[PDB]
Amino acid sequence: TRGIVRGGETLKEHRDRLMAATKATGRYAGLKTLELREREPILYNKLFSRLRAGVVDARETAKKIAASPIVEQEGELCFTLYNAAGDSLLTSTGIIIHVGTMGAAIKYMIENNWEANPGVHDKDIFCNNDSLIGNVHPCDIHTIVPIFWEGELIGWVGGVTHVIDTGAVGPGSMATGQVQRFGDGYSITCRKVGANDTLFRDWLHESQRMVRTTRYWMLDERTRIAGCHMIRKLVEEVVAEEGIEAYWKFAYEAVEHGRLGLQARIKAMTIPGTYRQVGFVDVPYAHEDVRVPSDFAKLDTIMHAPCEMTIRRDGTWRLDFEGSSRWGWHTYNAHQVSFTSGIWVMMTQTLIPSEMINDGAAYGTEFRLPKGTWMNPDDRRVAFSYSWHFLVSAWTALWRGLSRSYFGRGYLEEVNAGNANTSNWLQGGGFNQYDEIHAVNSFECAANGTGATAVQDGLSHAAAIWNPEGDMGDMEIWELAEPLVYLGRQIKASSGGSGKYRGGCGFESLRMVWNAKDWTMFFMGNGHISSDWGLMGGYPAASGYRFAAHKTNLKELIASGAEIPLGGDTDPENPTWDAMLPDAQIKRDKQAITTEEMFSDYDLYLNYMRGGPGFGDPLDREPQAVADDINGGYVLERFAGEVYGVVVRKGADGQYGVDEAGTAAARAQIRKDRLAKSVPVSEWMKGEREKILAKDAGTQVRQMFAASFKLGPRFEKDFRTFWSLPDSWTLPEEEIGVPTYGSRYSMDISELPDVHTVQFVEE
Amino acid sequence: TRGIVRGGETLKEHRDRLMAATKATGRYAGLKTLELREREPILYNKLFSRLRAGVVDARETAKKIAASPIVEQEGELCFTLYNAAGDSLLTSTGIIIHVGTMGAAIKYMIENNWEANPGVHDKDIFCNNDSLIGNVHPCDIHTIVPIFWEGELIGWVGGVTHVIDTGAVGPGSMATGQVQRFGDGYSITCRKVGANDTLFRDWLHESQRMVRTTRYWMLDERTRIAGCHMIRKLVEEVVAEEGIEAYWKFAYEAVEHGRLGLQARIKAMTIPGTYRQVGFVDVPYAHEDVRVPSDFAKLDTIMHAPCEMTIRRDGTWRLDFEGSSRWGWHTYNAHQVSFTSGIWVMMTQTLIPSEMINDGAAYGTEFRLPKGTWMNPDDRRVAFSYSWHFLVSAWTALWRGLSRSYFGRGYLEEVNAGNANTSNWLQGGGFNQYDEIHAVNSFECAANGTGATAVQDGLSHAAAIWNPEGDMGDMEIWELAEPLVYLGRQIKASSGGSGKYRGGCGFESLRMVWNAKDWTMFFMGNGHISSDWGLMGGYPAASGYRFAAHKTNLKELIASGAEIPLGGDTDPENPTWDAMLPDAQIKRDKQAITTEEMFSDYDLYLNYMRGGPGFGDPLDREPQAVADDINGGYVLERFAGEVYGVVVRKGADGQYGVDEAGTAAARAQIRKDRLAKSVPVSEWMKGEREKILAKDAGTQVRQMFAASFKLGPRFEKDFRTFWSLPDSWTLPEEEIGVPTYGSRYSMDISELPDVHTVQFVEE
């Protein structure tokens, strides 16, 4: 029975052959030479130039079909072209993390003999979003079309859209509320959803009633299908015009070219050696306003992600996450594919922007993700809807590590202290201004600030780790899809991390609920803990907080001519809105994660997008920059002196200027205070060691270590050595008093029948 | 192109033709005469006898394929045979409410042009459980196979199994936790799940990872498929032996025969006139241990289900539920198909046992269910997982109403005061004794007690409204599938409703958690309110309560030989176990509905199945019966005197005997006390009327009326008339202080694209 691949081999035989060559030889598919590229270089780039333009243009055109602004204006969609074995050749920009996620679904089909059943046929249509096979979160939905030529498969197209909602318990796309997979939303596992280019009615009727924002989902489906088919047609025209021979060579030489590309850029931009760095984020599920149904999920915890980054003389490199913490009862878990494609999107943004963007760099990187950590769970009950919470707090560390190598070597233009927490996600549900069931999810946190450089300040309100082409979207467009009105949009002062170069500031949006019925809202970002750290000096960006006002009496206040709250929440420590709202129930605290809360018309919700970390000692910053930050609204005048040692005087014009003698003398005095207030690290260490031996820390600090030691013995060994702790000191998780469900017992997806999962990671 | 039905017409043309004949003519399909039955009655019964044997025997055989005891021992499975238009011809016994649910699924396909897409092809396999189309709850999963003959559809087979769990937020089948459809478990809308008699791999992988109890679910599929295919093969053999002409006549004359049967039985057993009755149950979501994520769902409420039953001189009859309450944010909502097939299952149990069991009676009954009530919701966010809560408390009223017509006419053998609340459902989830993810759901409440008769006492621990073939299942078999050990099984004293004839007692099961890991449990029945009422006298059965013991210290108690709790909780007002467990956290209260709660090995959970209501004035009971009840454990000795006026004396043997002279005087004395403590109803009425005018009642009493008034103007008009209330007195729901989400705004499933829903009810 002939296999369907161009060879006559099956999908499985074909890929198994290619991975064997790759393993044995060290080069993708065994390609020790690139025949087309070396011998017919003109033909090689013409294919590259024409096909990469095709997918770029497909994404840009098709996104005019969607109703949701996330797809139509922000561009949270991607199109990828794959070879037979599910390796990408080329991609449009956008949410390119799904280069790898959709590649792994293609491989899951390959490895579980979809070929025999349900069959991969021409004109078929597959839809998938299953996180257990490596997708980021259910709200990101794939369409996958096989491409055939003269009767045989020659590759695949994938299209991803980020969809408003998938019917989880939480109303929104990064939803809280649910604590397991069951309730985490509509989960599609590589389903055959069409044949002969036409969708199945039983998929249409079932799928559309599993969600709130049906019209939005329906159109997000057509944006995918139209893109896939523009790309399928593109390929056929390219093959018919240049030949299957060349196309077939290109479909694999391109992928080894991407591996060759990563190696060469490492060797030219980096330094061999070892780099160590760590990242944390908070999960405050103890609080009253995280109302979750399962009692075993109400505890505070901290995500712990240490990375040992090894860079070798031959230009390979290794990322070891030994020491990391366990998955939990929340929606912040991830998958080994999620995680590693995340690290790949980062190398598309600094290491290989000017090389082939495809799975080549993936084959040139080594990943060790211990089984059972949050980044590699071993449990099929796990939940995913806001994977970015953990994911974006782990990858930010690696910017710093990678930036020390550019800095030592002299490529200071490339240093970057890391990504912002891509957060607060305005979410809610109910009846909207068209009186339809609806959900919300602002992609304003596509435009957080970004890490400072060794050369200049980070960009404000500019980007996210998962899409560098930032877009905040127009106020006038968002108000077509949410039942809220804007009372402010404002640069978020003192959100940027301080330094010689200041991190990018976030921004803020103040909303009034308007024309909503039976409406709820919630918040979802980091509160207690800043994920990014500064670099070579350099402080973390600000962390998160919440602001909601209920019963504002704002109908009367608007109408009677009284003061009403406008703009941003400029100094949350000295607020101005609260005085204006004497009757309101104001929620102003650090609890940056909540579940659904009744809101009504004229209630208030502050949307806050985070800043980025800074670079260098702050009192090396040029004083004039500090003064300009004060006028430009970037830094509150209070910290000009307290952080930068800059003394500013207001001119007749009302703007701030530099007092130079004052600024020098204040900097001189800060240096003596630093000497006087610090102590030798020897001294501090024996103090902290006493606290450790006494087990003096909150339950969430003690749980992070207990769980981390159990998954990563080399990390426990290192902690014990560092603090010089007796073997009599032990930290069993079960002694901390907090629930410990899922700490010993777990069941993996691979323990279910007929499941063959693909491994991409050392594990 | 040509339709698929044996005629050459499409499914839709075929049914549309037949429903028009039925509307114009008053007889199913226009059959004013029954050709086969009148002309070849021998051939007519031979087809009937062989086919009903086939479905009975198919259900019986295939249930030996299941691992879950729900299907294998208790038989909560059903097989039904349908004509082309989706009308049942015959059924096996068991959970026959799905006669109507699978018929409504077949008809939904007919109306939405499944024929065009995805196509109804021979050898195909459909799977469905969608409650918006009229299924009881997600856990009841249908398999639907078309039957073809010489290339044309001649009917369908449906198979139903109750599945342990479908991946709702709650672990169990009657799950709490979720408050909307989103989270209420895996919802399949008439999916084509196989072709050429083989299941699709993408359905297999996806479906098995959306639930906990996977191996159980897998085998429940094979039990369904096998029964369908035994029945498809059966028909073909019957047709090949007797001819398509005869079978095609039978497939429709059978259904008008059933309508004729309902009419003849009404006219023979009943009295024409009007019957009025009502039913209630509790929903105290206000309590701390109902932890739901949505703040708009935390309130107490009461289901209000009034029925005006009209029986006519021509033998038709009408059931109007005007006045009923609204659907809510819980899992107790229903659907018009759910509700009406319930009343049909009830009429199979008294009215037509000896007639054709098929849709004939459905065509002979009139139903009016106001749109927007809990029984006919107009909102597609609604949740269903424990529909029986409302459903079984509504139908019990109709037994009483129907019983007054037997009692007046003299068929006292047929009187029954109503069904028990079929409840408490022991449920929970975690890791079981085989160290696999698992969920539990005891079907011990298939064997509640039943209503007393005009002739004799109700049966104890015997049946449920949805399956009169009660089975409590073996202890030894239940312990193969739950990580619990039985410490007692006991008739539940004083659970039966008191009367001249006592209602049936429930029973109770005391469990110890054993060999469980990361384990939770919860409760799900009625607490505050008894659904059934007694009759012509007659008190309701006991209502519900909860008992759990945590930290029992029972390992130590067992090992040391101290007292351990065994058996049942004989007198909850004077317990013996609580003293035995001095270290325990004991939960003993009325809160019969909880969400998930951590349990551990040696903790205790009491499973309580309810009793049935009684008949007649209790102090007409033969005193000897009261004495036997006391010894037999049915009634606690305290109430012999207080309820029955029976004075019982303990003998030399230790058993109770009747004090005859004492019992006469006590009965003489009770009658004088009854006079002395009652008042003229006029007197009592003006007191209660002041309370109404003063709005003196719990928020749950005031919300039940507010919601009912808005949905049922004739009920408000009638309330106001009865209590003589000014037009100045008004009860707006929004003044009661509790959330009112979904009270004005709603969006029906019929408002989504391409949705054509079928109407079976006056509405």
Ligand SMILES: [Mn+2]
């Ligand atoms: Mn997304």
Ligand SMILES: [Mn+2]
């Ligand atoms: Mn069921």
